[model samples]
Target: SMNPPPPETSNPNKPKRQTNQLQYLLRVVLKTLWKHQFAWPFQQPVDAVKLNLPDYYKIIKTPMDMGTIKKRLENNYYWNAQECIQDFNTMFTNCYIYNKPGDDIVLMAEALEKLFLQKINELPTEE
Candidate 1:
C-alpha cells in the first residue's frame, strides 16, 4: 500500500504536558525539515499544470507539502504532534507513489524521512 498511515499518538510511558511544549518541539522539527538541502522540491505544493503532470492531482487526491504544513503548524491548525506528523508522511508518501524509485524527489523524501524519524522520536516530554 502506498498510503501513509496515521501517526502513533497513544503512549503509556510519556508524561503529558498541559503547556505548549510539544507544539514548540514540533515547530522546531518542521523548521529543520524546511532547511534541508534536498527539501527544495518538497518545499512547496506541486503545481501539476506548471509541471506538465496533469494526472498528479488525480492520482494524489490529498496534496501536502512543507509550505502547507508549516502554515498549518503556525496557524494552530494541528491538534497534536501526531496530527502534524501524519502530514509529513503524507507529503513524502505521495511523492513515492507518483515518482519513480531512486529518482531525485523520491530520494529527497527518503532522506527527510530518516531525519524526521530520528528527531521526532527523541523529543522530550514534560510533566
Candidate 2:
C-alpha cells in the first residue's frame, strides 16, 4: 500500500522518496503470476485440460517426461476456492510487512481476478 506523496508546497526540498521493498516485491510477484498464469496456489481449472502437455508442464518445469508430469499432477496439493481465498488473506495479513496503503491489495486482487477469468475463458465451448 503506497502512501500519497506529500504535498509539494509542504516542502520544496523534500528528500527523495523511499521505496518500500516489500510492496514492490509483492506487486512484482502478482504481476508475474497473472502474466504467466501458472504455478499459483489454486488448482488449474478443468478448462485447462484442453491445453497442450507443454503448457501444463511449463508451470512446474521439472526436467522429465510426460509420465513424470502425470505423477506430479496426481500428487500435487491443489487448492480449493476457499483455500485460495484464505491464502490471499494470509498474504495480506502476514506478508504485507510494510503496512503501506490498501491500494496494493486492490491491485493484487484485480490481477488475480483477471487470471481467473482467463482460465474460465479457456474452457471448451459447445459447438
TM-score of each: 0.79, 0.23
The model with the greatest TM-score is 1
Task: Score residue 68 of candidate 1 by CA lDDT.
Answer: 74
lDDT of 2: 0.32
The top-ranked prediction according to lDDT is: 1
Stretches off by above 4 angstroms in model 1 are 1-22
Global lDDT of each candidate: 0.73, 0.32
How do the residues 1-127 of candidate 1 rate in per-residue lDDT, one tens digit apiece?
A: 2334322333455444322544654457888888899888887788776688878877998778887777666655655667667888899889999999988888889999999888878766743
Candidate 1: worst 10 consecutive residues by lDDT?
Answer: 1-10
